[PDB]
């Protein structure tokens, strides 16, 4: 009654950490949506071969002041913009680019000091299910990477400060929460014995079957 795949795969799990500054070398965040970065969620999803689900992206944006020597700093409420890029969408090369105005990318505006912004994404795969394990080459004629089918693409996420708050520097952080909804699974497979190495593939280092003991009769 509790071990259903729903109650087993419907937990809000942080999947990203990054920072962007109102003024500075880094002024915007970018992260291609993937459930492979977080090992805790990756290992839970690698129980099944084919999985299909919806998302509920919920961000947590916090701002902290920086150690600067400018005086007479008067802060104004900060506004953050989070542009979701659909697969094949234009990606902002810079912070003040024109792509931040395309009516296709559904950006959500947020003003500091409110309930954290949340949006949902449907099943975007052209195929009929996201495939965790692919056993082929993405390119039709081959000469393409192994096990890298583009059917699982889920788009990219971009975030920036719409308005600089004060003359003094401000650095903000954003934590992206992943919540699969209406989950379905197919073809159960064995749990990953060895520890993960690269989020890109299934490469691993050989590991023993289990912890050893003194004698078989003990």
């Amino acid at each position: 009654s509790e071990s259903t795949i729903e109650n087993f795969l419907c937990r809000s799990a942080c999947v990203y950490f990054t920072e962007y500054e109102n003024s500075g070398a880094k002024r915007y965040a970018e992260w291609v949506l993937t459930p492979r970065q977080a090992a805790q969620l990756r290992r839970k999803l690698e129980f099944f071969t084919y999985v299909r689900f919806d998302l509920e992206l919920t961000f947590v944006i916090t701002s902290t002041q920086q150690p600067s020597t400018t005086q007479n700093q008067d802060a104004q409420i900060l506004t953050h913009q989070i542009m979701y890029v659909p697969p094949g969408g234009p990606v902002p090369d810079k912070v003040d680019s024109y792509v931040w105005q395309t009516s296709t990318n559904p950006s959500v505006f947020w003003t500091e000091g409110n309930a954290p912004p949340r949006m949902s994404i449907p099943f975007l795969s052209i195929g009929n299910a996201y495939s965790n394990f692919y056993d082929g080459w993405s390119e039709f004629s081959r000469n393409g990477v192994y096990g890298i089918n583009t059917l699982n693409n889920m788009g990219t996420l971009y975030a920036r400060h719409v308005n600089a708050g004060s003359t003094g520097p401000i650095k903000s952080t954003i934590r992206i929460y992943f919540k699969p909804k209406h989950v379905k699974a197919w073809i159960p497979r064995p749990p990953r014995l060895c520890q993960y190495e690269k989020a890109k593939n299934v490469n691993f280092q050989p590991s023993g079957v289990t912890t050893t003991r003194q004698s078989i009769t003990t």
Partner: protein, 231 residues
């Protein structure tokens, strides 16, 4: 007692109680060329006292073999069921166990963590690629990690029975028959570009015999595609 099964022109000899294990409770059906429904008997592989294992990719296993090879060539995409028969003929003074299992979408790890393996090293055409006991060296080679206690996929070999499997114990059993449905996210996929299922045969309990017996046991594998359709 023995019995004969005929598909097209080829014929196979099997017992009366064959103990078939259907894939996932589903028998292969058309999506909603009959001349491709025959018993494509592959080669025999000698099982010895030290043999680690073997593994075949069903689509590739039949890439050079006659009508199936010609069809999957011009035709684009398609789907295909399977009926793998593993027959292992050994005496009464021999002993040993085999795990016959069909693993769907078996992605295999590479010895060098940095890169993926090469196509030739991964796919064995018209022959059977085999595992290894000791770990594969990690250099600058696009080789496949062929450790048998990990099976290559990266998971403990013990719990490889989640997949449709069957055990051949040379004490009681002699053969295994596994029916496999077409499992793929996409309705139809290019057979050459992607392989859907991998047949794995692993000797858990080693072969053993007294001196003066046959030095090897010739396992024999027979594939018969069921309900193959193309676009």
């Amino acid at each position: 007692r023995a019995r004969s099964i005929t598909l097209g022109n080829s014929t196979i000899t099997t017992q009366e109680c064959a103990n078939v294990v259907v894939g996932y409770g589903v028998w292969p059906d058309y999506l909603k060329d009959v001349a491709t429904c025959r018993f494509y008997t592959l080669d025999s592989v000698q099982w010895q006292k030290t043999s680690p294992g073997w593994w075949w990719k069903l689509p590739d296993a039949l890439s050079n073999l006659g009508l199936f090879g010609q069809n999957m060539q011009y035709h684009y995409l398609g789907r295909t069921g399977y009926t793998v028969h593993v027959q292992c003929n050994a005496s009464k003074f021999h002993q040993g166990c085999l795990l016959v299992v069909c693993v769907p979408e078996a992605e295999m790890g590479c010895a060098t963590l940095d890169n993926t393996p090469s196509s030739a090293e991964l796919l064995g055409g018209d022959s059977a690629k085999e595992f290894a006991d000791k770990p594969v060296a990690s250099g600058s080679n696009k080789l496949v990690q062929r450790v048998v206690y990990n099976a290559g996929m990266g998971v403990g070999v013990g719990n490889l029975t989640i997949f449709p499997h069957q055990w051949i114990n040379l004490r009681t059993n002699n053969s295994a028959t596994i029916v496999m449905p077409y499992t793929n996210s996409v309705p139809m996929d290019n057979m050459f570009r992607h392989n859907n299922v991998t047949l794995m045969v692993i000797p858990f309990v080693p072969l053993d015999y007294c001196p003066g017996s046959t030095t090897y046991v010739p396992i024999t594998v027979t594939i018969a595609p069921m309900c193959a359709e193309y676009n």
